[PDB]
Scaffold this active site. Structure first.
Site, PDB file in Angstrom:
ATOM      1  N   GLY A  81       1.024  -1.048  -0.132  1.00 12.35           N
ATOM      2  CA  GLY A  81      -0.066   0.031   0.041  1.00 12.35           C
ATOM      3  C   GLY A  81       1.043   1.342   0.203  1.00 12.35           C
ATOM      4  O   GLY A  81       0.445   2.285  -0.551  1.00 12.35           O
ATOM      5  N   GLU A 106     -12.864  18.667 -12.239  1.00 16.01           N
ATOM      6  CA  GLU A 106     -13.872  19.535 -11.558  1.00 16.01           C
ATOM      7  C   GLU A 106     -13.747  19.040  -9.892  1.00 16.01           C
ATOM      8  O   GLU A 106     -13.634  20.137  -9.318  1.00 16.01           O
ATOM      9  CB  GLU A 106     -15.394  18.874 -11.983  1.00 16.01           C
ATOM     10  CG  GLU A 106     -15.852  19.924 -12.759  1.00 16.01           C
ATOM     11  CD  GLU A 106     -17.168  19.350 -12.987  1.00 16.01           C
ATOM     12  OE1 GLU A 106     -18.178  18.929 -12.447  1.00 16.01           O
ATOM     13  OE2 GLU A 106     -17.924  19.867 -14.152  1.00 16.01           O
TER      14      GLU A 106
END
Ligand SMILES: Nc1nc2c(ncn2[C@@H]2O[C@H](COP(=O)(O)OP(=O)(O)OP(=O)(O)O)[C@@H](O)[C@H]2O)c(=O)[nH]1
Ligand SMILES: Nc1nc2c(ncn2[C@@H]2O[C@H](COP(=O)(O)OP(=O)(O)O)[C@@H](O)[C@H]2O)c(=O)[nH]1
Ligand SMILES: Nc1ncnc2c1ncn2[C@@H]1O[C@H](COP(=O)(O)OP(=O)(O)O)[C@@H](O)[C@H]1O
Ligand code: ALF
Ligand code: ALF
Ligand SMILES: [Mg+2]
Ligand SMILES: [Mg+2]
Ligand SMILES: [Mg+2]
EC number: 3.6.5.-
Lengths: 430, 159, 333, 431
Positions: A139, A247
């Site tokens: 990870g 956005e």
């Protein structure tokens, strides 16, 4: 058309992915075999075959096989094509250096080859959604390696993260603060927007709101999946707000490094809540400004807002929303930075939140997810930085990283970058 | 000698002073042997239990009793560095020059163990400085072999 | 009598790689002893600018160590720095070019030049050993069969590499032939950071033993002349495969060197010399009986600022460490 | 990774090793013929960590049995699970080492070492993903100690990137009369400090004291001591043997337990303490397990943990219990006893709960501590060593085998540095 590729890295990333993809299928009416009796926006996340089967635009990667072996043997084994489920033999042993160098460099080319095959099927690739923990060797180490390699191959293409921030209640390694700081430093210039999920915040919501005595990853992931679905519904359904990856950056990121929004979700109600009826738009909106419903433990009252987005779903009317925002303005000491438009951005989807059938969550008529960039999130970095400092002052466990080809200078460099990040949050809205 | 024998050997090696006295009174054999041929006296000489060595000898233990390797309690107190026990055995008729199956004398054993004061007491009592083991080594040869200067000086005068 | 470790800083001119990219010369210099990086001053025993010569470095760093070794003291000179900062250049150099040779070939000469001047009734006995610490194994550079030599303790619990080729030299020519032999066995590879990147820690040891025929007096001096390999980020080196395995080991012994220094400057009751083999060899140079000079190498490039800072701060720390230096007896109880 | 390669050396190594294999075979539902007759899929999930699957339904321990003396091998074959072992994996000499570390390390052991490596290479090359090695031995004898450490160095040279793990049994005058045990133990500790990644310090002093003081066994036997060793070995390997999150492999355990390379000597602890085949029932509660597991009386190393500080701790609870209660009890112990945990290693206590209890118990707890108090064990050996070494006692037995006196000086120096290093971290402050 406007595709988004999801990458699930290591145990946390893969297990959260399982929960997200299960929920997306329920939301779009896709069966576990990829069939749907129900063009449409879900196509940003699912490709379609000639046989009418809908396949997730995703890659699942882990350096050990056990977690992904469950995906390829479980419910949803027919949903993903085998090539998109990638496993090695030996994990990163909770070591960032094994993830980034020793073990990770063995599978990096194969993972990029599989993402390349997925990107080749895209006509309008927006970019990537990367799911991983901060604490694990894969990870942390493999994600930073992958993020660097994606910036090379995809250039300007948007990259968003869903990062699992460590909590001692569920931690598996003493070295998690080291792995967290090293990954944050390395990934910082490669990520556009990152949503941290503090395992303690999720653990406490499960205990407090869902009456779960001892929350397991199954409990945590079902709740995490609900927040992820809220953040990604804007991309998977036809909206006005955060319809694309660009956005997200425009609406939530005022400065490149200050790219860590705070998610607050409401309502979180237990499946055992029997007589206690439906919460109003005002009640759920008020709940977004209370710290107990947050995805990261921190105090916004001690911080300043720099961007706010309210994503409503279900039986919600614009008149109800405006009324709620106005009262919030007259109530709570909700301060915005001097250099910013003091205004919220509102998203309304008419589909009520979907829950997994034998889940802990109750089905609600209306829900909301607030995404806010607050200087209060710097408190989460301070907690992690302090744990790093305690161990590093003694060079405790350092030998494990150096042995794998990392230099001590990388630890100092990573920590100085974190100190500059804390300094940036302080400078912002002085 | 039956149940009392196993219990006497156990009490002697454990240093259970009172429990040794009780078993004696109850009739435990002073010379009851263990699996290795060791009597309560050999065990007390290994473990350094002086008061027990004395009760056993007062109750007529065999001071020269040899185990299966041919070691007497003197060989054992000399090896284990128990000066006070070595002095007690010698005062009660211990064979200063007793030889085990390896040709070892208490002097070989005290020299090899490097117990200067035990060597000084064994020589006082007549330890043969010229005695050879089955390796053809004397106490002096052991001393030089171990590189024990102090001890080699001590043995040189006689040898 | 005591005296701290002497730490001397040497900046090299920006390399082609650096120049053929942006790279700004980030070091600014005040007097003969201070370098200034990002308005912070890092002061050493003597700072050498990029323009400094090989004879200039020698005259201010070593030359003093030659008198001391001859007088019965122990001397250690080691070059510390990031990959391609100039370690091997400072120490080895153009072994044969009069103006271009490093510290080691200059010591070798001035050892004999001083000796010819020394008392005619002084019997000298010089022996030399040359070895590397490649992949955390002590490999002899004068015997290829001896690939895993061991660090052992002497009577005074002073570590030393047991069984290296000890060669009795009698002329500077005799020494150079063996340095040539040694160099030509020493592991080197190609990193993006350096075309001839040293892949082991080079340990050259001069063992001078002197006896006066009239005084019946004996003196001894161990001269350590270590060219360490450099600390390296994989990002910069491009180190992959056997090149990276080499790197893993360099960073490991190097972080251990730092740990030993950290410990000594902080005055922590321990000191983990038992951490790297290298840090056990230098045990005497670091806490005890040796006059030590560390030559810290830096790249004035803006690219290597972080790393140049970390080398300077090691230097600063190291400069505080007080040695317990005395004369060597060669006594019989 | 997956496979662990087990090595059993000398009398103690083989007796404790054999007990390990019978205890774990029963836990995984494997009978003395190698056939699985259990009733839970959890028993077979990670079966490959310790067993190779042979032709048909049979499971064979990935175990190599080593001794310079043949007698122990015969005793193992004659044992309850004796027939489960690979016949070709029994590597035995005829001479013995006569409690001489030098005979085991340089002489007789060196003559047998290659025959052992032939067998370890065969087992290792058959591994899809080798985790590393697990050696059981004593430090007081000649084979287990001298040959065992020789094997460690040889195996490490060929497998430098694999984890080296040991169950090292420390000598005590309370159980063995052998004069030279401090020499053999000091010479071995010197090897272990340099060559192992993790060592479980199984102290005969502590095992004897538990049997005598707690179990009220007037004259303990190796059978009594070994019952505590096998309970410990089962407990410390639970995380490797069953599906779980914490310390699931040898490397993840080392990363969580070892903050400094040389400080890799663990103090194991177990609760409840029981005597051999004695009922029992009454099942301990979670606060009882939590208290008992952290008590000096329950430590398998003769050190008082309250005399030092924990650098790291791994706690394993076994049986059906409340995970909430475990979390509360574990947090209580570290909040109340804040001073026994180093402040500079945050969240240094890791807990695991395995639903499968060991046989005979409904509930159990195993503790693995990296405590600075382990220096007490090393100081005890060092004091015994110096008393002998100061007088150059028995030295020719070792130098006669080709060893140098300097190895004794070097071994002693190394062990005292280890003690000095523990003391440094014991006194260290976060500030
Ligand atoms: N929310 C959540 N956190 C998890 C889950 N699995 C692991 N974590 C957390 O992630 C961290 C451990 O990292 P992992 O993802 O398990 O490890 P990894 O990425 O597979 O890396 P290695 O196993 O070291 O190769 C700890 O903070 C765990 O609490 C999960 O399913 N959900
Ligand atoms: N716990 C335990 N210790 C033992 C056992 N057998 C011998 N020992 C101890 O091991 C040491 C003797 O070493 P041993 O194993 O017999 O020698 P080797 O066969 O040459 O390795 C002493 O400290 C004995 O107390 C046993 O089965 N269990
Ligand atoms: N002071 C210096 N002036 C000019 N060139 C130098 C200087 N220091 C180093 N160099 C050059 O830089 C290169 C790398 O130096 P080198 O000593 O081999 O690296 P390292 O520091 O890793 O040992 C060589 O080509 C060398 O000649
Ligand atoms: F020659 Al180098 F690091 F490049 F010592
Ligand atoms: F079996 Al041994 F010393 F070889 F007890
Ligand atoms: Mg994992
Ligand atoms: Mg070089
Ligand atoms: Mg035996």
């Amino acid at each position: 058309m406007r595709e988004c590729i999801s990458i699930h890295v290591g145990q946390a990333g893969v297990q959260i992915g399982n929960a997200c993809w299960e929920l997306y299928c329920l939301e779009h009416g896709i069966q576990p075999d990829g069939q749907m009796p129900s063009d449409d926006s879900f196509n940003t996340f699912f490709s379609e075959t000639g046989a009418g089967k809908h396949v997730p635009r995703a890659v699942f990667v882990d350096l050990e096989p056990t977690v992904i072996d469950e995906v390829r043997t479980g419910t949803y084994r027919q949903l993903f094509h085998p090539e998109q489920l990638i496993t090695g033999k030996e994990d990163a042993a909770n070591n960032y250096a094994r993830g980034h160098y020793t073990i990770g460099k063995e599978i990096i080319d194969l993972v990029l080859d599989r993402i390349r095959k997925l990107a080749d099927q895209c006509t309008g690739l927006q970019g990537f959604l990367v799911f991983h923990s901060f604490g694990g060797g894969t990870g942390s180490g493999f994600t930073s390696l992958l993020m660097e390699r994606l910036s090379v191959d995809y250039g300007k293409k948007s990259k968003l993260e869903f990062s699992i921030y460590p909590a001692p209640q569920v931690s598996t390694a003493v070295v998690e603060p080291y792995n967290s700081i090293l990954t944050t430093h390395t990934t910082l210039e490669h990520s556009d927007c990152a949503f941290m999920v503090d395992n303690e915040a999720i653990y406490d919501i499960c205990r407090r709101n869902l009456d779960i005595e001892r929350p397991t990853y199954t409990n945590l992931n079902r709740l995490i999946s609900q927040i992820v679905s809220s953040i990604t519904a804007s991309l998977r359904f036809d909206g006005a707000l955060n319809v694309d990856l660009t956005e997200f950056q425009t609406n939530l990121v005022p400065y490149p490094r200050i790219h860590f929004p705070l998610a607050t979700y409401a309502p979180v109600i237990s499946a055992e809540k029997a007589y206690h009826e439906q919460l109003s738009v005002a009640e759920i909106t008020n709940a977004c400004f209370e710290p107990a419903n947050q995805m990261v433990k921190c105090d916004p009252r001690h911080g300043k807002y720099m961007a706010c987005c309210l994503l409503y779903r279900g039986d919600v009317v614009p008149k109800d929303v405006n009324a709620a925002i106005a009262t919030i303005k007259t109530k709570r000491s909700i301060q915005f930075v001097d250099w910013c438009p003091t205004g919220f951005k509102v998203g309304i989807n008419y589909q009520p939140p979907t829950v997994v059938p034998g889940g802990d969550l109750a089905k609600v008529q209306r829900a909301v997810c607030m995404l806010s960039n607050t200087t209060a999130i710097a408190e989460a970095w301070a907690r992690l930085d302090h744990k790093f400092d305690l161990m590093y002052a003694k060079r405790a466990f350092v030998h494990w990283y150096v042995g794998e080809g990392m230099e001590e200078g990388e630890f100092s460099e990573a920590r100085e970058d974190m100190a500059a990040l804390e300094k940036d949050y302080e400078e912002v809205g002085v | 000698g039956s149940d009392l024998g196993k219990k006497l050997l156990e009490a002697a090696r454990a240093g259970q002073d009172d429990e040794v006295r009780i078993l004696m009174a109850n009739g435990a054999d002073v010379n009851a042997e263990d699996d290795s041929g060791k009597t309560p006296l050999h065990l007390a000489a290994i473990k350094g239990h002086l008061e027990i060595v004395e009760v056993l000898l007062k109750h007529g233990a065999d001071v020269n009793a040899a185990d299966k390797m041919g070691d007497t309690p003197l060989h054992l107190a000399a090896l284990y560095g128990h000066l006070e026990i070595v002095e007690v055995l010698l005062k009660n008729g211990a064979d200063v020059n007793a030889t085990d199956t390896y040709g070892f004398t208490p002097l070989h054993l005290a020299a090899d163990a490097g117990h200067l004061e035990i060597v000084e007491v064994l020589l006082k009592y007549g330890a043969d400085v010229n005695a050879q083991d089955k390796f053809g080594k004397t106490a002096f040869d052991i001393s030089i072999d171990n590189g024990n200067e102090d001890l080699a000086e001590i043995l040189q005068k006689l040898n | 009598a005591e005296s701290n470790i002497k730490v001397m800083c040497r900046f090299r001119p920006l390399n082609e790689s650096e120049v053929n990219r942006g790279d700004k010369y980030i070091a600014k210099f005040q007097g003969e002893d201070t370098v200034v990086i990002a308005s912070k001053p890092y002061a050493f025993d003597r700072v050498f600018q990029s323009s400094t010569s090989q004879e200039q470095v020698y005259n201010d760093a070593a030359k003093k160590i030659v008198k001391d070794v001859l007088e019965g003291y122990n001397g250690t000179i080691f070059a510390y720095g990031q990959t391609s900062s100039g370690k091997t250049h400072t120490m080895e150099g153009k072994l044969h070019d009069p103006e271009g040779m490093g510290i080691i070939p200059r010591i070798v000469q001035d050892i004999f030049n001083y000796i010819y001047s020394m008392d005619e009734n002084l019997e000298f006995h010089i022996k030399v050993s040359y070895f590397e610490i490649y992949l955390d194994k002590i490999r002899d550079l004068l015997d290829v069969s001896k690939t895993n030599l061991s660090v052992h303790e002497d009577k005074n619990r002073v570590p030393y590499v047991k069984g290296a080729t000890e060669r009795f030299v009698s002329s500077p020519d005799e020494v150079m032939d063996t340095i040539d032999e040694g160099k030509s066995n020493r592991h080197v590879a190609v990193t993006n950071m350096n075309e001839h990147s040293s892949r082991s820690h080079s340990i050259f040891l001069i063992n001078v033993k002197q006896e006066n025929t009239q005084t019946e007096q004996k003196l001894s001096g161990k001269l350590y002349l270590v060219d360490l390999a450099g600390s390296e980020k994989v990002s910069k080196t491009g180190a992959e495969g056997a090149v990276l395995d080499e790197a893993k080991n360099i960073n490991k012994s190097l972080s251990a060197l730092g740990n030993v220094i950290s410990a000594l400057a902080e005055g922590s009751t321990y000191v983990p010399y038992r951490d790297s083999k290298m840090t056990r060899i230098l045990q005497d140079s670091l806490g005890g009986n040796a006059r030590t000079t560390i030559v810290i190498c830096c790249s004035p490039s803006s690219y290597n600022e972080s790393e140049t800072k970390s080398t300077l701060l090691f230097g600063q720390r190291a400069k505080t460490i007080k040695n317990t230096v005395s004369v060597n007896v060669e006594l019989t109880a | 990774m997956r496979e662990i390669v087990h090595i059993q050396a000398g009398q103690c190594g083989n007796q404790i090793g054999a007990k390990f294999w019978e205890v774990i075979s029963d836990e995984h539902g494997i009978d003395p013929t190698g056939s699985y007759h259990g009733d839970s899929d959890l028993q077979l999930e990670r079966i490959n960590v310790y067993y190779n699957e042979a032709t048909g339904n049979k499971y064979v321990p990935r175990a190599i049995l080593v001794d310079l003396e043949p007698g122990t091998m015969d005793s193992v074959r004659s044992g309850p699970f004796g027939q489960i072992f690979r016949p070709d994996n029994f590597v035995f000499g005829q001479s013995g080492a006569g409690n001489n570390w030098a005979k085991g390390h340089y002489t007789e052991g060196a003559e047998l070492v290659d025959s052992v490596l032939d067998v370890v290479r065969k087992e290792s090359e058959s591994c899809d993903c080798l985790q590393g090695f697990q050696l059981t031995h004593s430090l007081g004898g000649g084979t287990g100690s001298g040959m065992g450490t020789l094997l460690i160095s040889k195996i490490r040279e060929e497998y430098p990137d694999r984890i080296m793990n040991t169950f090292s049994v420390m000598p005590s005058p309370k159980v063995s009369d052998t004069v030279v045990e401090p020499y053999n133990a000091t010479l071995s500790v010197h090897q272990l400090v340099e060559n192992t990644d993790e060592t479980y310090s199984i102290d005969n002093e502590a095992l004897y004291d538990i049997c005598f003081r707690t179990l009220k066994l007037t004259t303990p036997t190796y059978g009594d001591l070994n019952h505590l060793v096998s309970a410990t070995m089962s407990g410390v390997t639970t995380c490797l043997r069953f599906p779980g999150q914490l310390n699931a492999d040898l490397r993840k355990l080392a990363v969580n337990m070892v903050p400094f390379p040389r400080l890799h000597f663990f103090m194991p602890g177990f609760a409840p303490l029981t005597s051999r085949g004695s009922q029992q029932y009454r099942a301990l509660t979670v606060p009882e397990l939590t208290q008992q597991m952290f008590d000096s009386k329950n430590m398998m190393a003769a050190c008082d943990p309250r005399h030092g500080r924990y650098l790291t701790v791994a706690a394993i609870f076994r049986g059906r219990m409340s995970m909430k209660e475990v979390d509360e009890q574990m947090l209580n112990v570290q909040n109340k006893n804040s001073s026994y945990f180093v402040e500079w290693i945050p969240n240094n206590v890791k807990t695991a709960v395995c639903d499968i209890p060991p046989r005979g118990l409904k509930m159990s707890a195993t503790f693995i501590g990296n405590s600075t108090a382990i220096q007490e064990l090393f100081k005890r050996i060092s004091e015994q060593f110096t008393a002998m070494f100061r007088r150059k006692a028995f030295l020719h037995w070792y130098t006669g085998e080709g060893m140098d006196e300097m190895e004794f000086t070097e071994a002693e120096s190394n062990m005292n540095d280890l003690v000095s290093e523990y003391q440094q971290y014991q006194d260290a402050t976060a500030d």
